[PDB]
Structure 1
Amino acid sequence: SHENSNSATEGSTINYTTINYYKDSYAATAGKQSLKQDPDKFANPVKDIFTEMAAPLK
């Protein structure tokens, strides 16, 4: 399928696998995406990271 690259996720780190019948990419199905996740971005955004076994404050 050689179409237009106008999907909202064009140029996204997560790899999508979809189906489509029109020249416009956004008309495609939602499909399946990559299952990567980065919890630390929200749960552990400290400058100097501390280990599980250490005393957090030293």
Structure 2
Amino acid sequence: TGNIATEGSTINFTNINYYKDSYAASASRQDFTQDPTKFTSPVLDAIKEAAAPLQ
């Protein structure tokens, strides 16, 4: 499950820091987070899909 576009995994000698400072390390892009609600649904009363929103 990579971006290789074919069957194969190989061996992964990557993401190695060679310096005593950790900010010298390669871009930290192992983790992806998708929490859209803080921007798309910030209202107090959560509205169900089915129900007409204002009553």
TM band (smaller chain): 0.5 to 0.7
Aligned to 1:55: 52
Aligned to 1:5: none
Consecutive unaligned residues of structure 2, counting only runs of 5 or more, are: 1-14
Segments of 4+ moved more than 2 angstroms: none
Deviation at 1:35, TM superposition (A): 1.5
Work out which of the two has the higher radius of gyration on C-alpha atoms and give 1 or 2.
2
The CA deviation string for residues 8-36 of structure 1, in whole angstroms up to 9 with x for no partner, is xxxxxxxxxx4210000000000423122
Percent sequence identity is 61
Q: Normalised by the size of structure 1, how large is the TM-score?
A: 0.62
Consecutive unaligned residues of structure 1, counting only runs of 5 or more, are: 1-17
Q: Figure out how many residues of one structure are paired with residues of the other and give that number.
A: 41
